[PDB]
Each structure stands twice: as structure tokens, then as C-alpha cells.
Amino acid sequence: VLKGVLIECDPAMKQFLLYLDESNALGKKFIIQDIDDTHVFVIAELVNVLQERVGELMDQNAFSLT
Amino acid sequence: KKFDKKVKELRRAVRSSVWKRETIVHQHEYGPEENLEDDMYRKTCTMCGHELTYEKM
Incomplete structure (x- = not known):
């Protein structure tokens, strides 16, 4: 059995996380278990960098008016 | 040049039908x-x- 964090979101973000896992963007393969098309299993020790990457992807194609 | 163009326009047609799967499992x-x-x-x-x-x- 595994101990960690289940992450649920739209399939686009799941595919983005899979691309990050295969490209070693975070430096390792910590995206370990895939259970569903919209659910993934991730070790909680580095969830913060995943949030940072998601935020960077989100605000990259945003064109903030500030 | 027209001969080269008219052979080039069909050179890649056969090539595009060769590869089938791009994503690697x-x-x-x-x-x-x-x-x-x-x-x-x-x-x-x-x-x-x-x-x-x-x-x-």
C-alpha cells in the first residue's frame, strides 16, 4: 500500500503533470502512481514545487494587466 | 524550378503516410x-x- 496525496483535476493538468514526470522537470520521477484519467498519486514531500510549476504555467499565458 | 517544386509537393506526401505512432508508451x-x-x-x-x-x- 502507498502513503501520499491523491491529486484530482481536469485531464489537461493530469497530462501536464505526466509530461513533467517524463521530462524530469522536477529533477526526478516523483510522480509515481497513476490511478485514473483525472486522478494521480504524488508523494507529498515536494508538492510545493508542483504548485509553483502549475502557477507558472497558469500565469504564463495570462497577460496580467498590472 | 517548377520541376523541383512539382516533385517536392509530392515527395512528402508518401513520407507523411509512413509514420503512424508518435507518442512513446x-x-x-x-x-x-x-x-x-x-x-x-x-x-x-x-x-x-x-x-x-x-x-x-
Whole structure:
């Protein structure tokens, strides 16, 4: 059995996380278990960098008016 | 130049119909499990070196 964090979101973000896992963007393969098309299993020790990457992807194609 | 263009416009037509699958399958084919302390079991993927550590009840 595994101990960690289940992450649920739209399939686009799941595919983005899979691309990050295969490209070693975070430096390792910590995206370990895939259970569903919209659910993934991730070790909680580095969830913060995943949030940072998601935020960077989100605000990259945003064109903030500030 | 027109001859070169009219052969080029059909040169890539046959080429585009050759390749079928672009995405590479990344299935994790773990081998035999290794037993560590505290009832820990580790599986190593033979395709990319992926490691999965879990606890078996």
C-alpha cells in the first residue's frame, strides 16, 4: 500500500503533470502512481514545487494587466 | 524550378503516410520486488529506472 496525496483535476493538468514526470522537470520521477484519467498519486514531500510549476504555467499565458 | 517544386509537393506526401505512432508508451514494467526493513517492498521499473516503495499488509 502507498502513503501520499491523491491529486484530482481536469485531464489537461493530469497530462501536464505526466509530461513533467517524463521530462524530469522536477529533477526526478516523483510522480509515481497513476490511478485514473483525472486522478494521480504524488508523494507529498515536494508538492510545493508542483504548485509553483502549475502557477507558472497558469500565469504564463495570462497577460496580467498590472 | 517548377520541376523541383512539382516533385517536392509530392515527395512528402508518401513520407507523411509512413509514420503512424508518435507518442512513446511509458508503461512501467517493474521487476521483482526487493524487501527492506519495516515490511517495505520496492519495485524498480526496467524502462526508466522508476522506483516505487510501498508497504504490503
